[PDB]
């Protein structure tokens, strides 16, 4: 019944079309009209079957991929999309991305969303500060979900989007990839500001920057000290650890059998560990 029943041709995309059967929709609704009024479909109570007919017509119209004009309003049609189709998309507006990420909010990242993110970043040429803000907002563990190789392609300018808690899942490899980028982003700052910004990254910092910070009265939180690289705290002197921890040197004895602290103590002489007056023990015996 290719022909559309008389008086049933759709001049407009409205709710009156919900009582059209699938074939009635295929025969009575022109694809260009749908493309122009996509913005109305998400407010109409169309069944999954009728929405399938609609997506079929949208495909008929755009065989080279949808335009962002239609992709912004896809709504729950973005779920009936295939990754192959999304790989042909040119999505540029952050608001389009925010609208598509809101359709499957809460649930785990679907393959469609991964492909959308990849196409978006490959179009923008990088992972921007704004784009990273968006992605972390929708998916909090996004940053630490990237390999140390992928994480290496992040420009330093976008580090201003990385909040401290966004690194509470990153492994030492990722932290080591990130610390230079944050060092560059926060470079050109002065004193307490640099530290306030780089404290959450120092878990991937080397020994040289640690000594440089010690020589500038930083008063490093001991909880931050516990997050440092064991291999990077060993080559430090008692005077350096003292200048770094500032007044927080008191908590050393409380953390005397823990990751970095015990390994550092065991590599120091008791004659110098006793210079702190805190009662530390485990130093290389004199002689």
């Amino acid at each position: 019944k290719t022909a559309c029943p008389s008086g049933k041709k759709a001049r407009e995309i409205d709710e009156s079309l919900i009582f059209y059967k699938k074939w009635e929709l295929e025969a009575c609704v022109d694809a260009a009209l749908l493309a122009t009024q996509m913005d109305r479909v998400n407010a109409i109570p169309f069944t999954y079957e009728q929405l399938d007919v609609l997506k079929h017509k949208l495909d008929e119209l755009y065989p080279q991929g949808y335009p962002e004009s239609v992709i912004q309003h896809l709504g729950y049609l973005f779920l009936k999309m295939s990754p192959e189709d999304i790989r042909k998309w040119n999505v540029t507006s952050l608001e389009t991305l925010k609208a598509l990420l809101e359709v499957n909010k809460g649930h785990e990242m679907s393959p469609q969303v991964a492909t959308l993110i990849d196409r978006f970043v490959k179009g923008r040429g990088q992972l921007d500060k704004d784009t990273l803000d968006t992605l972390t907002a929708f998916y909090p563990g996004y940053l630490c979900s990237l390999s140390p190789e992928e994480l290496s392609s992040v420009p330093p300018s976008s580090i201003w989007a990385v909040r401290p808690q966004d690194l509470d899942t990153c492994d030492p490899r990722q932290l080591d990839v990130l610390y230079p980028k944050a060092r560059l982003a926060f470079q050109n700052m002065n004193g307490s500001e640099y530290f306030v910004k780089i404290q959450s990254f120092l878990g991937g910092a080397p020994t040289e920057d640690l000594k440089a910070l010690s020589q500038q009265n930083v008063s490093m939180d001991l909880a931050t000290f516990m997050k440092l690289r064991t291999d990077a705290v060993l080559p430090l002197t008692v005077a350096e650890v003292q200048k770094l921890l500032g007044p927080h040197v008191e908590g050393l004895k409380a953390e005397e059998r823990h990751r970095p602290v015990r390994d550092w103590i065991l590599r120091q002489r008791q004659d110098d560990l006793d210079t702190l007056g805190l009662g530390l023990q485990g130093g290389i015996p004199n002689g």
Partner: antibody
Amino acid sequence: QVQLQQSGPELEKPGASVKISCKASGYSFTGYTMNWVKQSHGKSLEWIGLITPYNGASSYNQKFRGKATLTVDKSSSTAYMDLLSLTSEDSAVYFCARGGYDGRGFDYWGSGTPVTVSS
Amino acid sequence: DIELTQSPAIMSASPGEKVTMTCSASSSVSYMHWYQQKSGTSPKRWIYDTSKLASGVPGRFSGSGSGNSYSLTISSVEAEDDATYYCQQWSKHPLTFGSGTKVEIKR
């Protein structure tokens, strides 16, 4: 099996409002439409509206706009109809019913919620 | 709104008789549905898409029609078919039901 468990009888005073429920069981109601029907004792049937839960979209019989508001909790696979500014004429039995696959009518009906509006 | 008028409003048929009730619409409707309702019960889907019988409906029931006129026919009325039958148009928004045809059994 497919089952539409409706809320219980209701009594409310004029000018008030009530909210009646329809728990769907035996199928994924996210794809189907949920329609609501009114039947006054000794009278025929009257379609109120329908709702799709995936986007919570709703289409109403213009007679019942401003009188019935359809909502859905997908967590519990439940649909709700809120009846507003109750009068005596709103006293009746309200059914929920599932829409067919391709517009094949209402294939599974609820049991009927009685609503009485009186002082 | 499409106004569906059912006729007869009340029908009295002896068991064994063939009976036919009609639903007349104010405008052409693509499809029609027929529900059976027995007192103190929720309506049950009897015929959908004009002529298809729903699961469990006896074969003596049939539905047909087009345009402005649709009909439901019982070949051999049996005492278990006393009830009110409602037609519903699935063409134009909003959905609309018929006033019903009530079927009583002669005895």
